[PDB]
């Protein structure tokens with residue numbers, strides 16, 4: 001039975017868009033339907049966040065915060081000075097004013113969304129010593145996000161998240177293939193990358209970098225510009241955080257809060273080869289991953305990064321070993337789900353035979369009951385003792 005009434009908040013990874021974007025084709029549900037709607041229809045109040053898909057987890061966390069409580073995104077004076085982009089971003093009305101009145105939320109996060117959710121909790125609870133000290137040094141104002149003390153988040157659930165990074169970023173032509181992946185997802189949503197679209201469709205929300213697709217500019221042409229831009233070449237990027245070294249850097253400061261439940265779901269869609277330790281894409285994996293990404297993930301090793309035979313099982317995008325929780329440079333703990341969910345520790349909820357895009361319904365999989373998956377999850381989150 002239900003032990004809390006906290007609303008659920010959905011949070012995408014390095015692709016993702018708002019419910020009004022992509023002509024209403026939902027990131028959360030894809031070709032299968034509308035997950036937020038399934039949850040709301042079953043009495044589990046649910047919202048969707050949309051943040052910069054290519055931006056750093058820091059930027060995304062500041063965006064999520066302003067998107068949740070309202071106001072103008074503030075990336076911090078220290079951060080903005082360090083990386084050379086605007087301090088202030090777009091303005092939001094505020095999804096959940098109940099939060100500033102003492103409410104809480106469950107965050108369900110897919111892929112890189114799981115890093116963002118963790119970082120948001122870390123900032124909400126502890127703030128940033130670097131931002132606090134900078135503000136005191138320069139006597140500039142400070143966003144409450146950097147002060148600490150917020151109890152907004154009852155739980156965080158990560159699904160197929162690269163807590164320890166993905167070796168996908170180490171591919172020789174990663175840059176071109178990463179943006180081909182963006183185009184494959186567009187295509188899955190019946191949007192072409194070579195059309196000179198004049199209206200919005202997919203906002204990458206790069207306000208801070210002053211970057212935006214021009215009207216009549218195709219996503220092909222736009223992505224070529226993004227490739228050469230600071231959101232691809234700087235350390236303040238999704239690209240860096242997604243890497244094994246970048247993920248560990250994140251892990252060294254983004255820790256589990258003892259006041260928060262953490263759930264993780266892992267994914268695999270591979271088989272192990274015969275005379276090799278390599279892993280290979282299963283029948284049914286989304287075609288782009290099976291052809292472009294999975295062979296590399298299931299065979300790439302790297303001694304300096306500690307990428308060995310345990311890293312080869314994957315879901316087409318992320319190595320499965322990375323998903324149960326942060327471990328590289330992390331003080332967080334992970335325990336197998338044993339029927340009772342515990343605060344302040346990663347509860348490994350199991351591994352599912354579902355690839356990176358199938359789990360959100362963006363690629364079909366008739367044998368996967370995606371409705372039941374998310375309904376069972378919502379039920380578990382509602383049972384959490386406040």
Ligand SMILES: [Ca+2]
Pocket residue numbers: 284285286358363364365
């Ligand atoms: Ca499939």
Ligand SMILES: [Zn+2]
Pocket residue numbers: 056058059075079083085236
């Ligand atoms: Zn930034």
